[PDB]
């Protein structure tokens, strides 16, 4: 069901080591709904190529836009199973600090705060 049920440890190491390659400059994150959200749709793929340069602020925005949502629809991102203590820290850092061991950054979102 979720992506490290559907992927090995190998095969998701092996597809970082192809996005290193092949798109440098990016940030692979996975972004997920809570297994309990009801309210916010879920989006039309797991697998994110994040420009480096770009805040959690903005990554925030950029969700939000995906989903399609309006200005009073609540909506929180989990990175790496906990609140960010920041929104303005550059997703290249964010990545150093929280990336997973298989690579990828895992983002889980709903609209509650309580997942
Ligand atoms: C080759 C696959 N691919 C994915 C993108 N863009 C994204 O994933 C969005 C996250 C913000 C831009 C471009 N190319
Ligand atoms: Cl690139």
Redesign the pocket.
């Given at each position: 069901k979720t992506f490290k049920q559907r992927r090995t440890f190998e095969q998701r190491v092996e597809d970082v080591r192809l996005i290193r390659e092949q798109?440098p400059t990016?940030i692979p994150?996975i972004i997920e709904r809570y297994k309990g959200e009801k309210q916010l749709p879920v989006l039309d793929?797991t697998?994110?190529?994040?420009?480096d340069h770009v805040n959690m602020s903005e990554l925030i925005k950029?969700i939000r836009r995906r989903l399609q949502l309006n200005a009073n629809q609540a909506f929180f991102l989990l990175v790496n199973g906990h609140s960010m203590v920041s929104v303005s820290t550059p997703i290249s850092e964010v990545y150093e600090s929280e990336k997973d061991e298989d690579g990828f950054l895992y983002m889980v979102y709903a609209s509650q705060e309580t997942f």
């Amino acid at each position: 069901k979720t992506f490290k049920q559907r992927r090995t440890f190998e095969q998701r190491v092996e597809d970082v080591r192809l996005i290193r390659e092949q798109h440098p400059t990016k940030i692979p994150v996975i972004i997920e709904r809570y297994k309990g959200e009801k309210q916010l749709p879920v989006l039309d793929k797991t697998k994110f190529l994040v420009p480096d340069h770009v805040n959690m602020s903005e990554l925030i925005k950029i969700i939000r836009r995906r989903l399609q949502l309006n200005a009073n629809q609540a909506f929180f991102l989990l990175v790496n199973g906990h609140s960010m203590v920041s929104v303005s820290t550059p997703i290249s850092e964010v990545y150093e600090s929280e990336k997973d061991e298989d690579g990828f950054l895992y983002m889980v979102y709903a609209s509650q705060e309580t997942f």
